[PDB]
């Protein structure tokens, strides 16, 4: 069944160290009959940016959500979406498509002095790269600052204060590929978490404690020349592209936050208990200028009742897979470890999105005789929209935890018996 | 599902962990002391194996529970 | 004698040498060592006095 | 109730010695109570690194150990240039505390 895109308004924004494009597609069906009811939507991706993808979500006019699955065709990893109501010929449906590309803004000078500003370059597409011929496409680009240097001209693109409009293209080919490149000033915090490890230890006695190790590096515009604390302090201009602090958002039940490094405590942080969450501003030991790869550890423990449900002999816990670290984050490697207690017999895990998973192993903390099972899940290219809830179901005999006191007892008893024999 | 499952409240109100830690230790420690005293004062002709076994078992039990509640009180939550 | 020993232990002998107690503390030593650890080549050679060896 | 002279004497000795040992251990930790627990005065960092080596590499590799990260122009043999008693004590306590799962990092064992 042939599909026609009628109106496509694409608004891209490039202010962050990220590229988010939202296309408001309007689809219509052709007048020809013997097509019945079309129920599938096809999405495409250009080969330039097919690997630098983090999330692709599709909604409908109003408040709604839809389901897309990856498909292969005989190549740009085409996706297909299942519409809620199948559209008959002559109908029209509005579908909002939002995608997020990571590691796509490259710093062009690539070396900036302690008293200069960042200039980045973006290479995307002019037209809506779809497998359907569209009719009216208009693109609006949102920048960080009003210091553009070279933007490709196609249709006399007018320029507003910080937003660039492109003339509506009357019609486009079957595959409407084109190269669009902007060179602008983006002195925003560029930050990449290289590898974050989240460890979640569950305890039926009290609460559950989650700690995460964070390697993070300032990617763009590496620093050349000398660094001087004097100029950094007595001149607020210099140091624009650097970072000083970032705030984490905690789930409002956190109780023991510590923020330790690999070498000791760090006394530079500020946590405020808010009504709905726990905000925590964090300063690293030193400001980051270019590729400075700070590494820290943040952990806390929260009440068990809030994230643990028990019925009969079954327990089920739901928690955030990846939790907030800073505004508009990006991860390159993420390993979740869920440390269940000893008698976790039937462990099933419901993943919201496809997560690469390794084999289970055993962990030996203090009062363990035969160890406790751990669940490991490896994922890559995580963004702020990957914050979901993962639930694990396991059966656990209630009597069995009593083996933890008794163990201690037996040790004591042995000592006394030894005395007796002596 | 997830709707018909009750919240998992702890079996022992955490506010009772401190009160339970001292007592269980104290009693335990007391018995322990007794045992050791008994092993230094009593000669070979004045030792009863059943009394020693009884007092040692009581001390071991109370001490194990007290040590658990203390170890959990500091926040290890074993 | 007990009271004297407690006071001398509390107010004189317990002190850190990595952190300068000023209550505000500035751990410049640790921050510099951490920078030197994370932002130098794997074979960089630093020379100082024998105290900070 | 009444107790023998020997029983009361033994009880008094035991109680006094227990209180004295507890006080000795309690009086030592003032700095740990204040600032976060870290090895200090930069003399024991060498001992600390050495202890970690003994705890993660073995004894035979530690007995004949050549360190190329210090006195770069020359060579420093740590396996035979220092009296090894403290490191051996710490590593033994660590391995005993790890056999029965009371898992504690090397730094906490060195500190206390
Ligand atoms: C081991 O490591 C850990 C972790 O690193 C160490 O713990 C850390 O210790 C520090 C102590 O220095 C703790 O700091 C504290 O942070 C809180 C929270 O403050 C934030 O929120 C404030 C809220 O402001 C509201 O109101 C303003 C208007 O007034 C609004 O504009 C806001 O929007 C809010 O609505 C905010 O004001 C704070 O701002 C500060 O930071 C910004 C930078 O982001 C600056 O620009 C600002 O100028 C300002 O400095 C901040 O955002 C503070 O409230 C704590 O302050 C108390 O102590 C101060 C002195 O240290 C004192 O000046 C304050 O008045 C306040 O005093 C309180 O307590 C006193 C007694 O102690 C009382 O006498 C007094 O009346 C008052 O009640 C403090 O700054 C970290 O939270 C802590 N981290 C963790 C994770 O716990 C630990 O110390 C280390 N161990 C060691 C070293 O041994
Ligand atoms: C004074 C009364 C004390 C009452 C005790 C109550 C216990 C309370 C527990 C402590 C509470 C802590 C509060 C707390 O935790 O606050 C937290 C903050 O967290 C912390 O950081 C603090 C953590 C600190 C925890 C430390 C706990 C450790 C407890 C250990 C305990 C103690 C008390 C006692 C130790 C005993 C030491 C033994 C000494 C050995 C004696 C040597 C014997 C000498 C000898 O040889 O004598 C011979 C005779 O031979 C013998 O028979 C002796 C054999 C004895 C062997 C052992 C017996 C000992 C029994 C003692 C009773 C003499 O020789 P002779 O006979 O003369 O030789 C002559 C022989 N001949 C030649 C045959 C005559 C709160 O923080 P919070 O904020 O709440 O954090 C929670 C936050 N969340 C995590 C929850 C979120
Ligand atoms: C992480 C937590 C780890 C917990 C560690 C647990 C520590 C266990 C403590 C072991 C206790 C040792 C037992 C002991 O002291 O043996 C005593 C002999 O008593 C003595 O003579 C003096 C020995 C005192 C040494 C106590 C130091 C123990 C410290 C261990 C940490 C027995 O002596 P007796 O046999 O009673 O001698 C009497 C002989 N008559 C004929 C006269 C009757
Ligand atoms: C003989 C054979 C057996 C040998 C047994 C050896 C006994 C070793 C005794 C030392 C016990 C170490 C306890 C300890 O490490 O406490 C310290 C600091 O926290 C504290 O406040 C502890 C200070 C006082 C606690 C002393 C209890 C020791 C009792 C031992 C009998 C913790 O330092 P941190 O590294 O800060 O731990 C916090 C990390 N969290 C993420 C969990 C928050
Ligand atoms: C007072 C003492 C009594 C003995 C004990 O401690 C407290 O209480 C025992 C439990 O019954 C444990 C078993 C439960 C079933 C579990 C099935 C797994 O499958 C298997 O791998 C391990 C197994 C058999 C557990 C081993 C440890 C046991 C025997 C524990 C001992 C340490
Ligand atoms: C009081 C002291 C002494 C007594 C003891 O605890 C501490 O109580 C014993 C338990 O019974 C443990 C076994 C349970 C079954 C479990 C089966 C696995 O399969 C196997 O790998 C480990 C195994 C055999 C446990 C080993 C440790 C044991 C023997 C423990 C002892 C060290
Ligand atoms: C006082 C009680 C408890 C302590 C103990 O006696 C009775 O005396 C311990 C020894 O120190 C033994 C360890 C030595 C180091 C060795 C390292 C290897 O690596 C490891 O495989 C074995 C290990 C840990 C030994 C195991 C048995 C221990 C803990 C012995 C216990 C039975
Ligand atoms: Mg348990």
UniProtKB/Swiss-Prot annotation, chain A:
Pathway: Protein modification; protein glycosylation. Keywords: Acetylation, Endoplasmic reticulum, Glycoprotein, Isopeptide bond, Membrane, Signal, Transmembrane, Transmembrane helix, Ubl conjugation. It is found in: Endoplasmic reticulum membrane; Melanosome. The keyword Acetylation applies. Glycans are attached at residue 265. The modification N6-acetyllysine is found at residue 153. Belongs to the OST1 family. This is Dolichyl-diphosphooligosaccharide--protein glycosyltransferase subunit 1. The lineage of its organism: Eukaryota, Metazoa, Chordata, Craniata, Vertebrata. The gene is RPN1. The chain holds residues 29 to 456 of 607 of the full protein.
Swiss-Prot record, chain B:
Keywords: Acetylation, Cytoplasm, Endoplasmic reticulum, Membrane, Transmembrane, Transmembrane helix. GO terms for molecular function: oligosaccharyltransferase complex binding. InterPro entries: TMEM258/Ost5. Ubiquitously expressed. It is found in: Membrane; Endoplasmic reticulum; Cytoplasm. The keyword Isomerase does not apply. One of its GO terms (cellular component) is oligosaccharyltransferase complex A. GO terms for biological process: epithelial cell apoptotic process; inflammatory response; protein N-linked glycosylation; response to endoplasmic reticulum stress. The keyword Transmembrane helix applies. The chain crosses the membrane at residues 16-36, 54-74. It is a multi-pass membrane protein. Pathway: Protein modification; protein glycosylation. It comes from the Eukaryota. Pfam families: Ost5 (PF05251). Belongs to the OST5 family. Component of the oligosaccharyltransferase (OST) complex. OST exists in two different complex forms which contain common core subunits RPN1, RPN2, OST48, OST4, DAD1 and TMEM258, either STT3A or STT3B as catalytic subunits, and form-specific accessory subunits. STT3A complex assembly occurs through the formation of 3 subcomplexes. Subcomplex 1 contains RPN1 and TMEM258, subcomplex 2 contains the STT3A-specific subunits STT3A, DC2/OSTC, and KCP2 as well as the core subunit OST4, and subcomplex 3 contains RPN2, DAD1, and OST48. Subunit of the oligosaccharyl transferase (OST) complex that catalyzes the initial transfer of a defined glycan (Glc(3)Man(9)GlcNAc(2) in eukaryotes) from the lipid carrier dolichol-pyrophosphate to an asparagine residue within an Asn-X-Ser/Thr consensus motif in nascent polypeptide chains, the first step in protein N-glycosylation. N-glycosylation occurs cotranslationally and the complex associates with the Sec61 complex at the channel-forming translocon complex that mediates protein translocation across the endoplasmic reticulum (ER). All subunits are required for a maximal enzyme activity.
Curated annotation (Swiss-Prot), chain D:
A motif (DXD motif 1) lies at residues 41-43. The chain crosses the membrane at residues 12-32. Residues 33-112 are lumenal. Component of the oligosaccharyltransferase (OST) complex. There are 2 OST complexes, OST-A and OST-B, which contain STT3A or STT3B as catalytic subunit, respectively. OST-A and OST-B contain common core subunits RPN1, RPN2, OST48, OST4, DAD1 and TMEM258, and OST-A contains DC2/OSTC and KRTCAP2/KCP2 specific accessory subunits. OST-A complex assembly occurs through the formation of 3 subcomplexes. Subcomplex 1 contains RPN1 and TMEM258, subcomplex 2 contains the OST-A-specific subunits STT3A, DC2/OSTC, and KCP2 as well as the core subunit OST4, and subcomplex 3 contains RPN2, DAD1, and OST48. Belongs to the STT3 family. Despite low primary sequence conservation between eukaryotic catalytic subunits and bacterial and archaeal single subunit OSTs (ssOST), structural comparison revealed several common motifs at spatially equivalent positions, like the DXD motif 1 on the external loop 1 and the DXD motif 2 on the external loop 2 involved in binding of the metal ion cofactor and the carboxamide group of the acceptor asparagine, the conserved Glu residue of the TIXE/SVSE motif on the external loop 5 involved in catalysis, as well as the WWDYG and the DK/MI motifs in the globular domain that define the binding pocket for the +2 Ser/Thr of the acceptor sequon. This is Dolichyl-diphosphooligosaccharide--protein glycosyltransferase subunit STT3A. It comes from Homo sapiens. The gene is STT3A.
């Amino acid at each position: 069944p042939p599909l026609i895109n009628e109106d496509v308004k694409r608004t891209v924004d490039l202010s962050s160290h990220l590229a988010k494009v939202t296309a408001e597609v309007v689809l219509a069906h052709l007048g020809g009959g013997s097509t019945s009811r079309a129920t599938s939507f096809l999405l495409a991706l250009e080969p330039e940016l097919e690997a630098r993808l983090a999330h692709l979500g599709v909604q409908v006019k109003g408040e709604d959500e839809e389901e897309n699955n990856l498909e292969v065709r005989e190549s740009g990893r085409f996706f297909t979406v299942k519409l809620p109501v199948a559209l008959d010929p002559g109908a029209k449906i509005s579908v909002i498509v939002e995608t997020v590309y990571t590691h796509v803004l490259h710093p062009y000078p690539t070396q900036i002095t302690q008293s200069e500003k960042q200039f980045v370059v973006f290479e995307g597409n002019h037209y809506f790269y779809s497998p359907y011929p569209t009719k009216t496409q208009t693109m609006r680009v949102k920048l960080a600052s009003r210091n553009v240097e070279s933007y490709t001209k196609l249709g006399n693109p007018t320029r507003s204060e910080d937003l660039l409009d492109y003339g509506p293209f009357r019609d486009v080919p079957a595959y409407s590929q084109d190269t669009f490149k902007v060179h602008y000033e983006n002195n925003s915090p560029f930050l990449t978490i290289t590898s974050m490890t989240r460890v979640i230890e569950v305890s039926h006695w009290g609460n559950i404690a989650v700690e995460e190790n964070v390697d993070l590096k300032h990617t763009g515009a590496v620093l050349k020349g000398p660094f001087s604390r004097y100029d950094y302090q007595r001149q607020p201009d210099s140091g624009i592209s650097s970072i000083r602090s970032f705030k984490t958002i905690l789930p409002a039940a956190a109780q023991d936050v510590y923020y330790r490094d690999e070498i000791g405590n760090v006394s530079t942080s500020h946590l405020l208990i808010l009504d709905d969450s726990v905000e925590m501003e964090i300063r690293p030991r030193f400001p980051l200028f270019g590729g400075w790869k700070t590494h820290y550890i943040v952990g806390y423990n929260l009440p068990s009742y809030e994230y643990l449900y028990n019925l009969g002999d079954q327990y089920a816990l739901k928690m955030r897979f990846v939790d907030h670290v800073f505004d508009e984050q990006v991860i390159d490697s993420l390993t979740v470890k869920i440390i269940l207690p000893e008698g976790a017999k039937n462990i099933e895990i419901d993943s919201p999105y496809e997560i690469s998973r390794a084999p289970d192993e055993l962990h030996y903390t203090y009062l363990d005789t035969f160890g406790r099972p751990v669940i490991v899940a490896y994922k890559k290219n995580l963004v702020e929209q990957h914050i979901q809830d993962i639930v694990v179901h396991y059966t656990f005999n209630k009597v069995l935890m009593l083996q933890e006191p008794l163990l201690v007892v037996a040790a004591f008893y042995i000592l006394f018996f030894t005395v007796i024999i002596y | 599902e997830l709707e018909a499952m009750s919240r998992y409240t702890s079996p022992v109100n955490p506010a009772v962990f401190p009160h339970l830690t001292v007592v269980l230790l104290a009693i335990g420690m007391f018995f322990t002391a007794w045992f050791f005293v008994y092993e230094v004062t009593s000669t070979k002709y004045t030792r009863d194996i059943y009394k020693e076994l009884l007092i040692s078992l009581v001390a071991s039990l109370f001490m194990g529970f007290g040590v658990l509640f203390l170890l959990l009180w500091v926040g290890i939550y074993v | 004698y007990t009271f004297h020993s407690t006071w001398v232990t509390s107010e004189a002998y317990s002190s850190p040498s990595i952190v300068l107690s000023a209550r505000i503390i500035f751990d410049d030593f640790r921050e510099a060592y951490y920078w030197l650890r994370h932002n130098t080549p794997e074979d960089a050679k630093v020379m100082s006095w024998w105290d900070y060896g | 109730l009444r107790l023998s002279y020997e029983k009361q004497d033994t009880l008094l000795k035991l109680l006094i010695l227990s209180m004295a040992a507890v006080l000795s251990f309690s009086t030592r930790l003032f700095a740990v109570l204040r600032f976060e627990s870290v090895i200090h005065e930069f003399d024991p960092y060498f001992n600390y690194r050495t202890t970690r080596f003994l705890a993660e590499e073995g004894f035979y590799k530690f007995h004949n150990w050549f360190d190329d990260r210090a006195w770069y122009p020359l060579g420093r043999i740590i396996g035979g240039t220092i009296y090894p008693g403290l490191m051996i004590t710490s590593a033994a306590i660590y391995h005993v505390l790890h056999f029965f799962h009371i898992t504690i990092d090397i730094r906490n064992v060195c500190v206390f």
